[PDB]
Amino acid sequence: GLPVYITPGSGQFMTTDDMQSPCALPWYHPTKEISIPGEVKNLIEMCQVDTLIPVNNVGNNVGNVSMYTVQLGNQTGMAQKVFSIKVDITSTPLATTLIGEIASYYTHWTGSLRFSFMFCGTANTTLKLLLAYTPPGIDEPTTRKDAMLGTHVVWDVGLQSTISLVVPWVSASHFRLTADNKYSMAGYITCWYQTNLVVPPSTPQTADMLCFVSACKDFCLRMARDTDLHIQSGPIEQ
Amino acid sequence: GLPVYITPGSGQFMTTDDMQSPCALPWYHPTKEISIPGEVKNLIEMCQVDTLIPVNNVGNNVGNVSMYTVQLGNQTGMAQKVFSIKVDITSTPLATTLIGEIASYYTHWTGSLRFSFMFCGTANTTLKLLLAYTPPGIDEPTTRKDAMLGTHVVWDVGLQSTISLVVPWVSASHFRLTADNKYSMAGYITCWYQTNLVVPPSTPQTADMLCFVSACKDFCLRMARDTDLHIQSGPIEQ
């Protein structure tokens, strides 16, 4: 018959290939597929929903919930600093986040990102923080002035309550690596006081702010790979 | 199904075959390909750019730069000779040259070739050399007259500075071998004084000439093979 030549790759097996295989039980009319509210079609979707950020990434706090709140304090001094985290989306505190947890399934990431903060303060309470995105290039800023110099957003706490800070995409390589890499260093984001936290009489003087991160329509990932954030130093029983 | 017959060659592997193989990570939209000034498409291009020739292929000179200059001297006598090299483009001094280095990647060569010379002399200085191409057939000429008899070019050093000598293609076999072969002997090229090197007062009396070789649109190679000019008597570490 057809003079054929069997090619090199032939007979192999790849955990990543698109090929057909004979059924196993022919003529099986599977159960119909009823209608079910909420079906996904793209990881992306999940990536665009803001999940909460562990940031109070500190000691005893960590195994608890607090590990999520950031109390905005006193501050005797002025123009003092709140916190910082680095943008490299696979870096505790980030990592664990619905996003992070994910990204860690792919080798490369890209686009803008969104950080949102909420005031679990009081009503009569007031404040004004300055948040900033310090692109890759230098060291996480020691001072506000130094950080205010780049990308930022002044946040006026008020009747609203949620300020969303965007993290533009600044990079040389259209794409960044999800894995820790000195090169693909995305930078830092930090928060400082613009004014203070003023509270009229008989209101607490510390209060919390929750923070979150969802994606931007910018966003996109690639090169699927097995995760980081989960070592099954098991096995698993029965 | 299809009554097939598996042919002899089947299952083999050739470092030289055009066949498809399953992707490995489907749906991978590679980084876009931005625009980049200067992209090659043919070795040829590289072959048409004149690279400098080591010719002062002599002893201590060789590991240095001088190994590139040819000083045009005194010459008490007249009608004396400068240098010679042989045309077989895979023969030190030639070989190492962008061309040579290359040709040594293929088994066969062909076409014309171009030798260019430049006067790194002075301005007030003057000279007239006679360059010649002595086709394959006899011995590199001992005397000028004997060599002037074949292909040549008288070169008048002047306001110009660069004389380019062409090496026509003379051969029996449309094609020549890149590898040393008594048969495929391309011949010799030599240079002699036509007049002298005259310099008015208080000008040096020796000066240099640089020489080069680029290809001709004639040119073409074939039968790729692994190079000569590089033995990795390694390995290579970390």
């Binding site: 018959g1 057809l2 | 299809l2 017959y5």
Partner: peptide
Amino acid sequence: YFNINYFKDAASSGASRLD
């Protein structure tokens, strides 16, 4: 499927036909 004399020569072919 048929008449695909994959081979050149005629001596090589299936069992003939009937008529």
